[PDB]
Design a protein around this ligand. Structure first.
Ligand code: HEM
Ligand code: HEM
Ligand code: HEM
Ligand code: HEM
Lengths: 143, 140, 140, 143
């Protein structure tokens, strides 16, 4: 992903204050709530009927922690996203059969979560930089 | 198709938005222009810089249309017919741009209403914006 | 939102399809399975080989669903309510797969009705299948 | 795009019987008719109101001939597709501002045109091989 030095500095600075446990679980739960067809993949997690049940699922929170850890790993290697997300791409394509559009949906949900968490600190330039990082992670995973 | 629960959620969220609708719409337009370059091409006669009065007025118009849609959720196709003709027949806007504008509106609402943006309200607003987009992308 | 002219076009094209609808449905499903293998994950108990009786029966069911949708084009949302609940609430099918099946149906129609597949008929059938995919995707 | 020898032979054999002038104009006109928002990029071609006027447009026919020539050039270089469509990708992304979804829409319209022109000879295996080639051309252009 090509980013300006200011864009990369802003992305790193915003990711500095991201709480790893809270941000990932909330993004995954909001994905499962807003796009209900995504629960097909996570049926093994457990009760996902109501939004309050989705947001209060320890398995969902733990998987969100894992997903956001992968996002952080991709952030630390922004110049080699395709090589960073190769094993995960194979896992999601060959074994899970997740459609590539769902990666873009999850990235957009994560951007909304970041905006909800940071408020006015999530300026439009920061949103643009994070949109590009999210698209790069999604294109790397869809490979 | 919306339900009474998410219809009430949408009405409450937009009422909490209130008089800041024009500011929110201008901010959403600026976010869309910054995040996506292709959307700007539809505004070659505009001044698309930060703090632009033209973008401010267009955001005011977009927010007024969204407020009308909120007030007229049950007859959206008949309430947004002129906008449908404008966007589809005359402007010929790609539906992907409608999706991007809906996303940027959601981001602005999340950034400005932390307490109001619960997951249920997020889903309700996503469905409402999707309904508006499909109404505007229909060719009669 | 279908026009009367496109409605007439779709009705005439499906009437010309006639009794070969079940074979066309089975061929469309086979094309979808062959060109988009991720769609096969929705049929784990099915035999998806060429000329399979299970795929033939499912294609016949899909074809009769499309036939009654054409016969009830004015009232699709309640003519396909049971199917919409099964597709969205029980099966949880991605709308991308609905787009893929609509494309494969269009390819089958093009291959089997060369004269009937004018550009106008193509557009009418494309938007009719898009409307059918909309009703099945919507969840209530 | 990776193809089996059988798929590659079938694709080449079917493409050897394609009439370049008719197939390209048909695909472009059907794109303009089915997806009317694509006429924004061709508003300089003249009359595009009626479908009969769209398919009877000499400018549309010539542009479709050029597009199918590019498709054939990509077909001859199925291993070098990103390199062949670098100039076209730059042209479509920087000066024309075409969304990548339109490339996939045009590819699907071309597949429908091939099925319409070849009838029973367009078997589901041939369709799958051509779908993969069309997806690769769209991905190469979208870069
Ligand atoms: C940018 C987007 C995504 C990233 C970075 C990501 C990352 C990950 C990671 C790190 C894992 C853990 C793998 C392991 O522990 O071995 C995983 C597994 C998984 N992912 Fe994703 N993921 C993304 C999108 C999605 C989406 C959108 C879905 C479904 C709609 C999905 C479905 C799954 C499933 C079902 C698993 C396995 C969980 C289990 O078996 O319990 N992923 N992904
Ligand atoms: C929920 C989505 C949208 C709403 C509610 C909306 C609403 C409006 C309104 C109220 C106007 C004023 C009409 C006029 O001034 O003549 C307008 C015009 C316009 N819209 Fe939209 N719009 C939406 C989406 C979009 C998108 C996504 C784009 C482009 C990417 C777009 C492009 C335009 C353009 C170019 C104009 C003409 C502005 C002018 O002539 O000054 N619209 N829209
Ligand atoms: C696009 C138009 C479609 C139509 C008209 C249609 C129609 C039908 C019909 C009539 C049935 C039989 C239900 C019953 O007899 O109770 C059915 C079942 C089913 N459909 Fe669809 N369908 C469509 C799209 C899809 C797509 C795109 C998929 C998957 C990619 C899908 C997956 C299924 C599955 C898994 C079943 C259950 C069959 C079984 O478990 O034996 N459908 N559909
Ligand atoms: C998907 C595969 C596509 C291929 C292989 C392709 C190929 C080409 C080629 C070879 C040219 C060169 C014409 C020249 O240099 O004068 C061209 C130009 C152009 N393309 Fe495409 N194209 C594709 C998709 C699209 C789509 C989907 C659109 C619009 C929705 C589009 C819009 C244009 C336009 C507007 C021009 C310039 C026409 C002119 O200046 O007269 N292209 N394309």
């Amino acid at each position: 992903v090509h980013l300006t030095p200011e864009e990369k500095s802003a992305v790193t600075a915003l990711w500095g204050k991201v709480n790893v446990d809270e941000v990932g679980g909330e993004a995954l739960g909001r994905l499962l709530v807003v796009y209900p067809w995504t629960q097909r993949f996570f049926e093994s997690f457990g009760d996902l009927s109501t939004p309050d049940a989705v947001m209060g699922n320890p398995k969902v929170k733990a998987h969100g922690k894992k997903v956001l850890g992968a996002f952080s790993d991709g952030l630390a290697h922004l110049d080699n996203l395709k090589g960073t997300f190769a094993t995960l791409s194979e896992l999601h394509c060959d074994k899970l059969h997740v459609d590539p559009e769902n990666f873009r949906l999850l990235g957009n949900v994560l951007v909304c979560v970041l905006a909800h968490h940071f408020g006015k600190e999530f300026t439009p330039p920061v949103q643009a930089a994070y949109q590009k990082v999210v698209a790069g992670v999604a294109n790397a995973l869809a490979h | 198709v919306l339900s009474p629960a998410d219809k009430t959620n949408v009405k409450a969220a937009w009422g909490k938005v209130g008089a800041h609708a024009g500011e929110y719409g201008a901010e959403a337009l600026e976010r869309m222009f910054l995040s996506f370059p292709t959307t700007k091409t539809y505004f070659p006669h505009f001044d698309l810089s930060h703090g632009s009065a033209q973008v401010k007025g267009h955001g005011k118009k977009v927010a007024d249309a969204l407020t009308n849609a909120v007030a007229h959720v049950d007859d959206m196709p008949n309430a947004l017919s002129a906008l449908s003709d404008l966007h589809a027949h005359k402007l010929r806007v790609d539906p992907v741009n409608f999706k991007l504008l809906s996303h940027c509106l959601l981001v602005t609402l999340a950034a400005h209403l932390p307490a109001e943006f619960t997951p249920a309200v997020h889903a309700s607003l996503d469905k409402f914006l999707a309904s508006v987009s499909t109404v505007l992308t229909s060719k009669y």
